[PDB]
Symmetry: C2
Subunit: 364 residues, 2 copies
């Protein structure tokens, strides 16, 4: 245990100031090193805090899953409740760890930096300034006139040496005491936070390990199998859908054109129902479909289907309108007219007129 001699302070030898210099070099080296350690440990504390926050947020989000108003379980919902429980338990372990790290690791290393190293620098400056004042006082004293006596000036210059030497002595001794005390504090401040950190880790691993049992392992293995099941169902569904799409592309290719090959797609004149898009008149396109003796209609941005025409005992005929092709008009058993409706081809045109006639004459 290195120690500065307080007994040597009054004499204030260069050799004494030399010994001081070595305690000051050490104090600077110690400060440099303990600062790097403070910064590393501060990063551990901050990260553990962030971990506690993010883990708790994860759990909370898993709990809110139900409370979200979803358009499209008993198994999923409960599965997520089980995950949210274990994650929230783990979240508590981090929260307990973070607070113990703040108390048992950060507090003592902060105190070393903010109290003890601060005191060294303060005492060092008070001393430097006392030393400077004394140097000045003894210089002025040394220059007193031997030949012309002036009692008052001589007193004042002598008294300034008294006060400055007294101040220098007291400040040097207190600075020596702090530097000597620092030999002990350097050791406490190194070991105490490490011990705090390690005891906290022992508590953390014990606490987390008690929440992580064979029962959890069972639950996890079960979820692993569920995930494999979903993947298998998905992959099978993909296969079914890819085949459905390839079939539909083949079947639909000849039907994309408004006017299909009339030898392959004859006009159906015996339908009892039809549905499809038509233009109506100043012209909007909407979806028409027959239902229970009614022609109903629905636009793309609409919730349900409105009414267009009653088609019990109605008449329907081809119409000429605004130089357009494939127009027709219904007149119900009221004598009242529908909008002028437009089909997309001769066959579509004929199909609508025939279907409406079919429906109109079967209510009997």
């Amino acid at each position: 245990m290195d120690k500065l001699p307080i007994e040597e302070t009054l004499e204030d030898s260069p050799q004494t100031r030399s010994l001081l210099g070595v305690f000051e070099e050490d104090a600077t080296a110690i400060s440099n090193y303990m600062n790097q350690l403070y910064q590393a440990m501060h990063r551990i504390y901050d990260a553990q805090n962030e971990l506690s926050a993010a883990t708790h947020l994860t759990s909370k989000l898993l709990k809110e899953y139900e409370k979200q108003r979803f358009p499209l379980d008993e198994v999923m919902s409960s599965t997520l409740q089980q995950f949210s429980k274990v994650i929230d338990e783990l979240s508590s372990c981090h929260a307990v760890l973070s607070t113990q790290l703040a108390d048992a690791m950060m507090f003592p290393i902060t105190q070393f930096k903010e109290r003890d190293l601060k005191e060294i620098l303060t005492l060092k400056e008070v001393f430097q300034i006392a030393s400077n004042d004394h140097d000045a006082a003894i210089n002025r004293y040394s220059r007193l006139s031997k030949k012309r006596e002036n009692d008052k000036v001589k007193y004042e210059v002598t008294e300034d040496v008294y006060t400055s030497r007294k101040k220098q002595h007291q400040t040097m001794m207190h600075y020596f005491c702090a530097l000597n005390t620092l030999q002990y504090k350097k050791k406490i401040a190194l070991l105490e936070p490490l011990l705090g950190y390690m005891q906290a880790q022992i508590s953390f691993f014990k606490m987390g390990s008690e929440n992580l049992n064979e029962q959890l392992e069972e639950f996890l293995a079960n979820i692993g199998t569920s995930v494999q099941n979903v993947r298998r169902e998905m992959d099978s569904d993909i296969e079914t859908m890819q085949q459905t799409i390839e079939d539909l592309e083949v079947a639909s290719d000849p039907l994309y054109v408004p006017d299909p090959d009339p030898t392959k797609f004859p006009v159906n004149r015996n339908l009892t129902r039809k549905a499809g898009y038509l233009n109506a008149r100043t012209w909007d396109r909407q979806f028409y479909f027959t239902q229970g003796g009614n022609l109903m209609s629905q636009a793309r941005g609409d919730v349900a289907g409105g009414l267009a025409m009653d088609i019990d005992n109605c008449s329907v005929m081809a119409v000429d309108c605004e130089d357009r092709r494939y127009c027709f008009q219904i007149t119900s058993f009221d004598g009242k007219k529908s909008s002028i409706l437009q089909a997309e081809s001769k066959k579509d045109h004929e199909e609508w007129i025939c279907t409406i006639n079919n429906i109109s004459k079967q209510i009997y």
Copy 2:
């Protein structure tokens, strides 16, 4: 398992577009929610990484403690080597955890966001644009002139309906397939990262717990007692120093003035050695001290003491110089002169002259 009917795509009913709208609302809600979960889990991964880094840095700093060139152990040094070992083991646990979190939690949730949700938005746009093109094509077709036949224009306008309806159909079906596939992926992407995270935690707690044994507890209890010992030694040393300082303040108060009470502090004329600061001449203050028949000297910024005068068989006398008080000059047994030296009081002046004379005449 909710599913859109691919069979309904060609007809493209408002009621079909209505069902699509509900799958799209769900996909948006799902994206929103999974994004929040991605962000929370990303914060866990980042924090665990930072923890791994800061813990490893802590250990490394503890190892470098010796390799720092310190002005002022076997116990401390080895104590720090034991801490650095356990902390580096813990550092490895975090490093193992971080990499498994990246692989088993982050990768699958990233893929959901970057592959699967991206595909939904891409397919949705391709479809919207196909739908818009078809709307335009059927509008132009609907406007063909019934009266003036022009085969080429009629062909081109009809063919644009073919191509746009074909494109709309294919794009709608592929978009339906992805949305249907998404019902399965939503479940995988929720459960797979949770399972990855939990299995990683089980490995971590097991791994960390195997490094934290009864033997470590023994080591920690021993360090706790050492710290208590250092505190006790420190507190006792503080008490000793405070008393030394109070004694020195009492003893030194009458000695701070250059000229002490001459009835209480007689001039010592029988010294065989003296040491103290003197001015020398254009005047510098330095520390003089007698050693082995030599007067030696040392400035504040100096490593060792240089030579001023040999004081075997020398003469010394009071001198008048530059109107200064308390000046004297040595002349050795060579006949050569020292600098003009200045003392700080009559008593200091007399004490130096007497001591030098004492030393000069005892070599005999």
